[PDB]
Amino acid sequence: MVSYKLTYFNGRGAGEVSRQIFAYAGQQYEDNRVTQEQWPALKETCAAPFGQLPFLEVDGKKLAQSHAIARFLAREFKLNGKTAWEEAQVNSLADQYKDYSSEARPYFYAVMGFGPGDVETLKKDIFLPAFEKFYGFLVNFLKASGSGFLVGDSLTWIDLAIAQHSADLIAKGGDFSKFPELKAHAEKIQAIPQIKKWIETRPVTPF
Amino acid sequence: MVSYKLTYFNGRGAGEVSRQIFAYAGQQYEDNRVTQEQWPALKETCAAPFGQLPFLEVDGKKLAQSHAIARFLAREFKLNGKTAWEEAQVNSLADQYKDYSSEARPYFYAVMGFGPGDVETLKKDIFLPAFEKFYGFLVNFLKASGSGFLVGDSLTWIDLAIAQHSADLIAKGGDFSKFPELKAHAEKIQAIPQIKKWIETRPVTPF
Ligand SMILES: N[C@@H](CCC(=O)N[C@@H](CS)C(=O)NCC(=O)O)C(=O)O
Ligand SMILES: N[C@@H](CCC(=O)N[C@@H](CS)C(=O)NCC(=O)O)C(=O)O
């Protein structure tokens, strides 16, 4: 019927939330994964609206930007929030999640390989202050909603994105003593059957 | 009888687009501009959801994050796109605009007196490459829409935001030789009567 194709690198990363949205919705899509080695020719192809991944094609029309794609798909499948106000709070938290990711990027770059710096020092000087600030806000949202979801009484795509990040940190030995609520959040979201099923079946990748 | 209150600094900055959405719509709101002397105080207060401005109050309920606010307000006033696909595209460009703003930030901060470094050097090494990349994407959007607006055939909030950025850069001595299209766009959007009136009456601030 409507045809979806998601183009991203062969990894979870910024595409993953859109894949998880499709899984919850039970929507068929083409998971187009591009390798490091293939990217140059695709980039020269001018396919990507801003020269970057991910991008989504909906009946061949192109949409860039990870969060624009996630919001677009979540609104189609009723995962963006149950009222206008909830949609906006979801957006607020997702944008604050972007600011966390910018603050933490020097650490994640050194850890992954892509950048310079001593990892122990960046952990304490850059990652932990960023993580503690942002996760304190997550806990505020959990307490406000009172449901176990970040916004309102049901699942939204920011739950999926945040649960995936938390799961990744935990798997690498991250200490959640300050935020046991987010450990519980990550377990809760990743047990939702459609999501558990996707996690069990997706390609295994380092990121 | 929904009551709106916008809290931001005494400047255009990240609050301005919301003020312009309200001006376009003819919607009364409280334009709450915070002084250096109030701020530390309001910050200590946990008034702001994430400790930062802007935030919007809607019958007393708080919403943070400049883009989340603009999107919430634009959707209430039909300035976010006329179809779900236009709303996504507005979202995609607005997010690329955030990426540009992040790349240019070292320069903007130096000019504003918030950050280190030599303005002349930052202008050419950091700002101009960012500006030229992003404004080339703006031209692609204008050519695709075919109407003089960035997305589709009528005004959206990203027109307001981009026109105001362009008008500021031009006013302050910027060279738009490479992008005559965006100077025309700025002139068109800033001549809209509600907008022209707001520009002539708002507090005059450097930023
Ligand atoms: N604001 C963007 C960032 C996009 C982005 O940084 N993409 C990277 C992911 S590795 C990329 O495609 N880099 C390859 C390149 O710029 O050639 C988004 O959220 O989708
Ligand atoms: N992602 C943000 C950033 C908000 C922001 O950086 N606010 C600055 C504006 S000057 C601020 O409130 N700084 C004062 C402070 O952090 O105490 C948004 O778009 O609203």
UniProtKB/Swiss-Prot annotation, chains A, B:
This is Probable glutathione S-transferase 5. The lineage of its organism: Eukaryota, Metazoa, Ecdysozoa, Nematoda, Chromadorea. Keywords: Transferase. It is an enzyme of class 2 (transferase). It comes from the Eukaryota. It holds the Pfam family GST_N. It catalyses: RX + glutathione = an S-substituted glutathione + a halide anion + H(+). InterPro entries: Glutathione-S-Trfase_C-like (IPR010987), Glutathione-S-Trfase_C_sf (IPR036282), Glutathione_S-Trfase (IPR040079), Glutathione_S-Trfase_N (IPR004045), GST_C (IPR004046), GST_superfamily (IPR050213), Thioredoxin-like_sf (IPR036249). Glutathione binds at residues 8, 39, 43, 51-53, 65-66. Its EC number is 2.5.1.18. Residues 2-81 form the GST N-terminal domain. Belongs to the GST superfamily. Sigma family. GO terms for molecular function: glutathione transferase activity. The keyword Oxidoreductase does not apply. The gene is gst-5.
